[PDB]
């Protein structure tokens, strides 16, 4: 009984939303490039303890918690596959923004994001094969984008390195460019919220169901908690603990959306076509809640 | 593979891609090349 808006993909509002998302990504990267320098990146690359522990946490927890959640909640096969693909996806770039919100040594954050994406393009089909045994015996390994991952990584890294160079060359443009970028980020975020509300319409209520909401709410919170626990277990620095925990919970749901769209017809994946959106809003809300908790704890310290 | 989409780290719909001429939102998107989609008869099943 699931229905989609009559012209979902092809509409002026959706095109505007796509452009606004692109501008969000570019300006977020540009504004984030101010807080990192080459020397710290080199230092973190030379000492791979944090990088390795972050990869281990992400790629040994996210698919694992996805599979465990699906088995525990006795989800439908399509839903279990959807959350499994979401878990197998690399960490998104929203983790970098969240780490900036907790002043979390952004050099390690960007290094972890880049290495996580690069390791994803290799080992995501492997995790899909070794975790989808029992649901969808189909291959599902040629449906994962490969060249798109590399192009997206390069296109993300370009504005960040532009900002880093602009920093290292001449600080004087921080108070002339960062404030403007923050302003455009704010207006574009408001536009994104209203445009998603307009585009989705009332079809989201089909996605609303006690099982999908439960899994998509448990997944990012479990990711944050497990990342924090595992990073603190290895006697890592507190700033490193915070950034690792915040990165391991964030996910790139766009890959899951494209993979599910390619693998199956729209009628098979009808009600959970909005699952990436649910995961995105829930991870955003939980990140904001953690931001508020951290700032309240800081006030408690002072 | 058959997926030629440039994923956007901030994105929740299949048309959110970092591609200059936004064909994914046009009438004829061409980021996927799999016509042999699996109908998956046991999709709506629990184990």
């Amino acid at each position: 009984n699931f229905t989609l808006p009559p012209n979902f993909g092809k509409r002026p509002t959706d095109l505007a939303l796509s452009v606004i998302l692109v501008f969000m990504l570019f300006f977020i990267m540009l504004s984030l490039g101010c807080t990192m320098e080459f020397s710290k990146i080199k230092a973190h690359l030379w000492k791979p303890k944090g990088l390795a522990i972050a990869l281990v946490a992400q790629y040994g927890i996210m698919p694992l918690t996805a599979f465990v959640l699906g088995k525990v909640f006795r989800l439908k096969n399509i839903e279990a596959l959807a959350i499994l693909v979401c878990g197998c996806s690399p960490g998104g770039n929203l983790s970098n923004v969240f780490s900036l919100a907790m002043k979390g040594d952004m050099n390690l954050s960007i290094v972890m994001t880049t290495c996580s994406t690069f390791c994803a393009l290799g080992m995501m089909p492997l995790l899909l094969y070794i975790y989808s045994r029992g649901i969808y015996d189909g291959d599902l390994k040629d449906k994962v984008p490969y060249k798109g991952i590399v192009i997206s990584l390069v296109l993300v890294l370009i504005p960040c390195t532009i900002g880093i160079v602009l920093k290292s060359k001449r600080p004087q443009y921080m108070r002339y460019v960062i404030k403007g970028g923050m302003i455009i980020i704010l207006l574009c975020s408001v536009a994104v919220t209203v445009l998603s509300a307009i585009n989705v319409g009332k079809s989201i209520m089909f996605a609303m169901t006690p099982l999908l909401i439960a899994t998509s709410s448990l997944m990012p919170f479990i990711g944050f908690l497990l990342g924090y626990v595992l990073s603190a277990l290895f006697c890592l620095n507190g700033r490193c603990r915070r950034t690792v925990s915040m990165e391991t919970g964030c996910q790139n749901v766009q890959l899951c959306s494209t993979i599910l769209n390619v693998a199956f017809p729209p009628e098979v994946i009808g009600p959970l076509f909005f699952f990436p959106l649910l995961y995105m809003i829930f991870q955003l809300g939980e990140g904001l809640l953690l931001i508020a908790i951290f700032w309240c704890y800081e006030k408690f310290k002072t | 593979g058959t997926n030629l989409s440039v994923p956007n780290p901030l994105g929740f719909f299949p048309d959110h891609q970092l591609d200059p001429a936004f064909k994914a939102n046009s009438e004829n998107p061409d980021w996927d090349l799999n016509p042999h989609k699996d109908n998956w008869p046991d999709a709506n099943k629990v184990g």
Partner: antibody, heavy 120, light 108 residues
Framework: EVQLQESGAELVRPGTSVKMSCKAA????????IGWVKQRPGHGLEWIGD????????NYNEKFKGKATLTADTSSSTAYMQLSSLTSEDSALYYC?????????????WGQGTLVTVSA | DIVMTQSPASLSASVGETVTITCRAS??????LTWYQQKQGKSPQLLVY???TLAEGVPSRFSGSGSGTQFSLKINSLQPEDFGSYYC?????????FGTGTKLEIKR
């Protein structure tokens, strides 16, 4: 104008292989699927298999899986089918067809057809 | 595997007479069906795709309407230029079955 050109009529004794070509013109030929359809004069149509010339990805009908082989040869832009072992059953008219979206499986442009007769 | 069947195996109609042909699918295919028209001694040509939209360069008199398991192809005004077999096909499954034929012939 996109056009598909077939090789021509063939007459082959049973048990021997035969291959036919579908030269494509008027478009890139590298980013569009090609499907092969076999039609008997006294029966309906049936779908043999599909080939993507860009990457060589192919999908085959289960019935024709054993005795159909598809090749791209993107340099000359001529798709090929190999019939492998031949019997009197598979004497029909063979069509090469191209999709339009690469996402849906309705063919838009068809070749002139290749007639294959199997008999000793 | 999905089996496609066409109701009228043969059908005769004079020029300028409305006529419909019915297609039936074994399972639900969510209007993933396309109509082909083949003339005598010619390769088949795409006529209607997705069971509703008319292909490029086709006369406007053709019309198709259906979803699920029942499909139809009205011709409305009948012209001598179109007289031949008509075929169906689905994209839902992998085997892509083609269904049987439906021949249109002159009436006298």
């Amino acid at each position: 104008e996109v056009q598909l050109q077939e090789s021509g009529a063939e007459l082959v004794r049973p048990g021997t292989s035969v291959k036919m070509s579908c030269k494509a013109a008027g478009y890139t030929f590298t980013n569009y699927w090609i499907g092969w359809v076999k039609q008997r004069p006294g029966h309906g149509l049936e779908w043999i298999g599909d080939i993507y010339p860009g990457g060589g990805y192919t999908n085959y009908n289960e019935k024709f899986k054993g005795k159909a082989t598809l090749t791209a040869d993107t340099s000359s832009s001529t798709a090929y089918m190999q019939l492998s072992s031949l019997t009197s059953e598979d004497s029909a008219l063979y069509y090469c067809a191209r999709m339009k979206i690469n996402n849906q499986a309705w063919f838009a442009y068809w070749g002139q057809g290749t007639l294959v007769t199997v008999s000793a | 595997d999905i089996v496609m069947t066409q109701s009228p195996a043969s059908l005769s109609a004079s020029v300028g007479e409305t006529v419909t042909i019915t297609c039936r699918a074994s399972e639900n295919i969510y209007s993933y069906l396309t109509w082909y028209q083949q003339k005598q001694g010619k390769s088949p040509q795409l006529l209607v795709y997705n069971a509703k939209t008319l292909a490029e360069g086709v006369p406007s008199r053709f019309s198709g309407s259906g979803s699920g398991t029942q499909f139809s192809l009205k011709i409305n005004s009948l012209q001598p230029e179109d007289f031949g077999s008509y075929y169906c096909q689905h994209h839902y499954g992998t085997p892509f079955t083609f269904g049987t034929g439906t021949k249109l012939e002159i009436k006298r």
